[PDB]
Amino acid sequence: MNLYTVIFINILLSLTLILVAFWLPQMNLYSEKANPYECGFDPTSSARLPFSMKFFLVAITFLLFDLEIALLLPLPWAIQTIKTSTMMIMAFILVTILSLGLAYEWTQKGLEWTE
């Protein structure tokens, strides 16, 4: 109950500041004020057009590496096992293959951003 209570208060405080910030100040809306900023000149296109991602391969590698750490985060419970040798070999093998995967991608220039 307590965790729910404090997070609601955190939400409540943030939303109150937003309401104050939008209803206290004097406003003056006109078109030139609300147009998008681009260093004093008009944009030549939408900001909604495609924006190329040069690190796209690192990005999807990160998806796999993020499930690798998910497999590592039970380790504090796993070190309590009687089967210490089995746990240790499994953890060593898991870390080593992930290193080999990173090493391969590194030597394939998979960490280099595209030009």
Partner 1 sequence: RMMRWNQERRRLLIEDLEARIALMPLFQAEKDRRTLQILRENLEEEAIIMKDVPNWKVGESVFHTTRWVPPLIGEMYGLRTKEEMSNANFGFTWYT
Partner 2 sequence: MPSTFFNLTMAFSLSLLGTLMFRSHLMSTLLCLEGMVLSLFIMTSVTSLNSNSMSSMPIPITILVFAACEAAVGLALLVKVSNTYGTDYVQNLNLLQC
Partner 3 sequence: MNNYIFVLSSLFLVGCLGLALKPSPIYGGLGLIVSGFVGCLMVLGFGGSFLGLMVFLIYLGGMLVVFGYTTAMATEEYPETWGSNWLILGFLVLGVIMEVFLICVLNYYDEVGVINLDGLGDWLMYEVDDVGVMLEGGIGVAAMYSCATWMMVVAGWSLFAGIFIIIEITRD
Ligand X SMILES: CCCCCCCCCCCCO[C@@H]1O[C@H](CO)[C@@H](O[C@H]2O[C@H](CO)[C@@H](O)[C@H](O)[C@H]2O)[C@H](O)[C@H]1O
State the residues that interact with partner 1 by CB under 8 A. 1-3
Q: How many CB atoms lie under 10 A from the CB of residue 102?
A: 15
Q: Which residue has the tokens 């309590």?
A: 80
Q: How many CB atoms lie under 10 A from the CB of residue 55?
A: 13
Which one of partner 2, partner 3, ligand X, none is in contact with 43 (Cβ closer than 5 to 8 A by kind)?
Answer: none
Least Å distance, CB 104 to ligand X, is: 7
Q: Which amino acid type is present at position 53?
A: M
User: Binding string, 28-67, against ligand X, x = CB under 6 A?
Assistant: ----------------------------------------
Which one of partner 1, ligand X, partner 2, none is in contact with 84 (Cβ closer than 5 to 8 A by kind)?
Answer: ligand X
Please identify, using beta-carbon distances, which residue of 41 and 77 lies nearer to partner 3.
Answer: 77
Contacting residues for 47 by C-beta, under 8 A, at least 6 apart: 36
Rounded-to-integer distance, Cα 32 and Cα 12, Å: 34
Rounded-to-integer distance, Cα 48 and Cα 51, Å: 8
Extract the tokens encoding 18. Answer: 């937003």
Q: How many helical (H) and strand (E) elements, i.e. helices and strands, does the chain have?
A: 5, 0
Please identify, using beta-carbon distances, which residue of 6 and 110 lies nearer to partner 3.
Answer: 110
Which one of partner 1, partner 3, partner 2, none is in contact with 3 (Cβ closer than 5 to 8 A by kind)?
Answer: partner 1
Which one of partner 1, partner 3, partner 2, none is in contact with 93 (Cβ closer than 5 to 8 A by kind)?
Answer: partner 3
56 sits near partner 2 (criterion: CB under 8 A): yes
